[PDB]
Design an enzyme around this catalytic site. Structure first.
Site, PDB file in Angstrom:
ATOM      1  CE  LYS B  11      -3.942  -2.361   2.136  1.00 27.25           C
ATOM      2  NZ  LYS B  11      -4.650  -2.659   3.396  1.00 27.25           N
ATOM      3  CE1 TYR B  51      -9.040  -3.650   0.409  1.00 28.56           C
ATOM      4  CE2 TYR B  51      -8.445  -1.530  -0.593  1.00 28.56           C
ATOM      5  CZ  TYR B  51      -8.104  -2.646   0.163  1.00 28.56           C
ATOM      6  OH  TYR B  51      -6.823  -2.771   0.677  1.00 28.56           O
ATOM      7  CG  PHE B  59     -13.526   1.204   6.930  1.00 28.52           C
ATOM      8  CD1 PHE B  59     -12.886   0.596   5.843  1.00 28.52           C
ATOM      9  CD2 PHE B  59     -14.270   0.414   7.775  1.00 28.52           C
ATOM     10  CE1 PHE B  59     -12.997  -0.763   5.625  1.00 28.52           C
ATOM     11  CE2 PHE B  59     -14.384  -0.960   7.556  1.00 28.52           C
ATOM     12  CZ  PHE B  59     -13.738  -1.545   6.473  1.00 28.52           C
ATOM     13  NE  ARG B  87      -5.805 -12.358   4.463  1.00 30.47           N
ATOM     14  CZ  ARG B  87      -6.827 -11.561   4.674  1.00 30.47           C
ATOM     15  NH1 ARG B  87      -7.678 -11.750   5.683  1.00 30.47           N
ATOM     16  NH2 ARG B  87      -6.960 -10.539   3.871  1.00 30.47           N
ATOM     17  CB  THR B  93      -7.337  -6.864   9.396  1.00 28.42           C
ATOM     18  OG1 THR B  93      -7.763  -8.039   8.702  1.00 28.42           O
ATOM     19  CG2 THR B  93      -7.779  -5.611   8.655  1.00 28.42           C
ATOM     20  NE  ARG B 104      -1.861  -5.729   7.430  1.00 29.75           N
ATOM     21  CZ  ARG B 104      -2.675  -6.623   6.875  1.00 29.75           C
ATOM     22  NH1 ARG B 104      -2.973  -7.761   7.484  1.00 29.75           N
ATOM     23  NH2 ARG B 104      -3.170  -6.374   5.668  1.00 29.75           N
ATOM     24  CG  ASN B 114      -3.625  -2.560   6.789  1.00 28.72           C
ATOM     25  OD1 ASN B 114      -3.497  -2.017   5.672  1.00 28.72           O
ATOM     26  ND2 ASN B 114      -4.543  -3.514   7.046  1.00 28.72           N
ATOM     27  CG  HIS B 117      -4.717  -6.682  -0.422  1.00 28.49           C
ATOM     28  ND1 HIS B 117      -5.997  -6.761   0.087  1.00 28.49           N
ATOM     29  CD2 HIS B 117      -4.622  -7.667  -1.355  1.00 28.49           C
ATOM     30  CE1 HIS B 117      -6.660  -7.712  -0.552  1.00 28.49           C
ATOM     31  NE2 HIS B 117      -5.837  -8.308  -1.399  1.00 28.49           N
ATOM     32  CD  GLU B 128      -7.827  -9.557  -3.729  1.00 24.19           C
ATOM     33  OE1 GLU B 128      -6.629  -9.795  -3.444  1.00 24.19           O
ATOM     34  OE2 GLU B 128      -8.766  -9.602  -2.889  1.00 24.19           O
TER      35      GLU B 128
END
Ligand SMILES: Nc1nc2c(ncn2[C@@H]2O[C@H](COP(=O)(O)OP(=O)(O)O)[C@@H](O)[C@H]2O)c(=O)[nH]1
Ligand SMILES: Nc1nc2c(ncn2[C@@H]2O[C@H](COP(=O)(O)OP(=O)(O)O)[C@@H](O)[C@H]2O)c(=O)[nH]1
Ligand SMILES: Nc1nc2c(ncn2[C@@H]2O[C@H](COP(=O)(O)OP(=O)(O)O)[C@@H](O)[C@H]2O)c(=O)[nH]1
Ligand SMILES: Nc1nc2c(ncn2[C@@H]2O[C@H](COP(=O)(O)OP(=O)(O)O)[C@@H](O)[C@H]2O)c(=O)[nH]1
Ligand SMILES: Nc1nc2c(ncn2[C@@H]2O[C@H](COP(=O)(O)OP(=O)(O)O)[C@@H](O)[C@H]2O)c(=O)[nH]1
Ligand SMILES: Nc1nc2c(ncn2[C@@H]2O[C@H](COP(=O)(O)OP(=O)(O)O)[C@@H](O)[C@H]2O)c(=O)[nH]1
Ligand SMILES: [Mg+2]
Ligand SMILES: [Mg+2]
Ligand SMILES: [Mg+2]
Ligand SMILES: [Mg+2]
Ligand SMILES: [Mg+2]
Ligand SMILES: [Mg+2]
Lengths: 151, 151, 151, 151, 151, 151
Positions: B11, B51, B59, B87, B93, B104, B114, B117, B128
């Site tokens: 990100k 998303y 949000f 993951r 998250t 993270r 964060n 993704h 995706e």
């Protein structure tokens, strides 16, 4: 805003084993802001007051002696939930219960030589900050990364 | 299932905080094969599709505007259980729940910043990858180390 | 107690993937003492003896072949609870179950290519140490940092 | 300022040996801005044009085949003196002459497998950029640390 | 068609200061192949033989004594130009003249505690390998990476 | 000359770019003893005294302003040739001429944002040490590794 602060001390063993830079890097890369830092050998009395709640514990004599046996790096770090998150970063009190990836998990073995201290609560942090630093030693600045670290 | 693929995006905060090589190294080190990679400022419309499942959450608009606020690094990684393992590697998250040693856990503090993704399932991964890459952008080659990572 | 020892072996995949130093560094920085170390291609017989408890498992032929397919780094490390703690550092048998920050969690993917061996008990450790090392190959010295790692 | 740009490519060997993240980190940590990045197997004709000034050299055929033998990471990096200081960071053409702490000095051995390419001049950089990227693939953004990297 | 080889030993200070893994990592990362390795306290006699060319120099008794004061990691590494390149990686004899990025440059201060030995020449390499290792301790195997390190 | 000292300051750009731990680690790893450390925003007047020899230089006013624009980490390091060796570790005054492996070579670009200061001479070191520290802030202790770093 005026973010949460915590008191972090690298114990004499952390200093003697050459882990100061490593440990500071972990806080920096996390995105916490260094507010204060100094380097000293804290007196036995200073350390007695730091650990006042533990005075009747049997390991307390040796703890104070170990803690006065070399210099320490005292720091204040700022950020959202830095107290609780600082603690997760350290690992458990006992390095034996500390997971790989934590400071204690990665770097030590025994509870008596567990390289670092972090405040266990906000009320602890504020007491410890007041004991270790003069108000003037706490530097108010803004981190360049702030808006990339916080909404 | 050695040919499983996942979509990983660094990100804007990840790019801005200089974590691109650090993140890529973690995937490389683990034994996953890099299949596709590009660097772009994704349009607001592209991000709304990415998303789309979140379009009604409060949000969402903030999330989209932030995702458009800088370039991202889009990647496709391949390997056995790469979706689930990817993951695990990113952590939860919310960075507050992410363990030290995770991306993270090591590098960020707030859910809105964060840094990365990863697809949450094979089905999401497939959607995706299709959204973000042209089929010709998925590179066919065999990893050097494959016979040392897999039976 | 503090004189406990364990047998650690970096498997042919760990050597081939260039992880010898990275693995050793993890044990050094934790505060464990390197007692013995050598580098060899273990014979199929030697390997069958090391894994004698698994002789009738379906994967055992592939296990013995893989383990003979390249050289191995054989080591003995000393410290408090080094057997148990060594295992924690390695991760779980299956890298899929191994967390980020452990050797398998960070570096591998499949159980048949899981880069490293550690003794699962003190009795196992003493058997494996006897199997892999001549008594004279076990070096007695005191670690510089011992008193900063142990009270 | 309209800051200088250079073209950097991680060669197929850099990709296969798992050095993409490491390399990218060195550019990031220096304070350069990533302008463009993609991952592709460059066609022999693309590679011939890239290395056109070497076409009559005896190693040219093998060079083109090796450069076609796996994917490459193609990048454009921005910064003051980025072309010349980029070259310095890479080492000398021959890894035998590249100093420790440079990319080829730390990671490779033979001129024909020297892991990375960097533009040798501003004029070469602009030519190489034009040949490897579409104009729209060059991302325009400002680095959050810009004013801490530049006066 | 045996590639060039050199003898490298991590000196007692290297071991005591917890740099074994760091040092080995540098050789693996470079692309050299580990041929042989063991860990031992070298006897005064063995060391006088190793440094026999220096036997009349003033510092020789001190050197031999220091070299016997703890265990040493003895290794054979193979690759193109490994003797000379190995040297360059170590730095100069005197750490004061060793550049940052070299092993002695990064880690040492004084010539009598210079953490590592590397052969000075092919003829010396051949002599040292024979002195420290039995032929059967030299492992013949092919490196995973060879075709990405060598044309 | 083993008790030679130098003054090292991490400039505000170094603090803001999150290089404090990285820099301290390089000094630690080298074998120098940390004598004194504090963190503060140095006043314009204090900085004018620090840089008094440059007071007539066109960049002087901006230098003082920049050095006051954020906190610095002020430090005293001890060891044989620590002044000269410290300078070599930093690089050259100009990052553009600083070699990869040096602090400036690795991490910065422009002379006006060159991340760090180190005393240029023993005389300069004694003047700076006295300017920045109270006598009581120079901590007296022995480094555990001393006898492994020094004869
Ligand atoms: N030697 C020794 N030290 C202990 C023991 N328990 C706690 N300590 C030390 O005392 C410190 C403070 O204890 P405590 O506040 O309970 O734990 P902490 O907040 O997690 O550090 C620990 O960090 C240890 O350094 C013990 O059983 N033995
Ligand atoms: N600002 C904000 N962003 C959120 C929140 N929850 C999730 N996000 C963002 O939306 C992204 C996608 O949400 P989600 O799919 O549930 O989490 P993920 O799959 O783990 O990334 C997350 O990665 C966050 O960047 C929230 O409460 N506030
Ligand atoms: N291929 C394969 N190898 C296995 C399997 N289970 C165990 N192994 C291998 O055999 C080794 C010894 O098995 P075990 O003692 O149960 O696991 P460990 O003590 O955690 O190493 C493991 O480390 C693996 O390399 C399996 O199901 N398949
Ligand atoms: N196989 C082989 N490749 C070479 C030789 N000389 C140069 N090269 C390759 O060709 C590339 C381009 O050469 P050149 O433009 O002169 O050097 P560079 O700009 O430093 O990369 C080098 O980076 C090497 O990959 C050689 O003698 N043999
Ligand atoms: N104490 C001391 N040791 C030295 C001196 N010169 C060399 N040595 C040590 O002796 C070793 C062998 O010296 P030499 O073979 O000339 O240098 P080398 O090939 O770089 O290791 C060096 O690596 C140092 O450990 C000195 O002046 N004093
Ligand atoms: N903006 C700017 N700052 C400079 C220039 N030259 C020197 N400086 C700054 O002034 C500091 C002191 O200069 P000097 O004492 O000559 O070099 P030093 O001892 O290597 O730091 C440098 O470290 C820079 O921070 C310049 O041309 N422009
Ligand atoms: Mg407490
Ligand atoms: Mg989702
Ligand atoms: Mg078993
Ligand atoms: Mg050229
Ligand atoms: Mg010699
Ligand atoms: Mg000056």
């Amino acid at each position: 805003a005026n973010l949460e602060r915590t008191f972090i001390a690298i114990k004499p063993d952390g200093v003697q084993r050459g882990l100061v830079g490593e440990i500071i890097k972990r806080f920096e890369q996390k995105g916490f802001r260094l507010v204060a830092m100094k380097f000293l050998r804290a007196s036995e009395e200073h350390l007695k007051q730091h650990y006042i709640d533990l005075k009747d514990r049997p390991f307390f004599p040796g703890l104070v002696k170990y803690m006065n046996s070399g210099p320490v790096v005292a720091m204040v770090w700022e950020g959202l939930n830095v107290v609780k998150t600082g603690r997760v970063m350290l690992g458990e009190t006992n390095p034996a219960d500390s997971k790989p990836g934590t400071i204690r998990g990665d770097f030590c073995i025994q509870v008596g030589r567990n390289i670092i201290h972090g405040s266990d609560s906000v009320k602890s942090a504020e007491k410890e900050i007041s004991l270790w630093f003069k108000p003037e030693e706490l530097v108010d600045y803004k981190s360049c990364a702030h808006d990339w670290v916080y909404e």
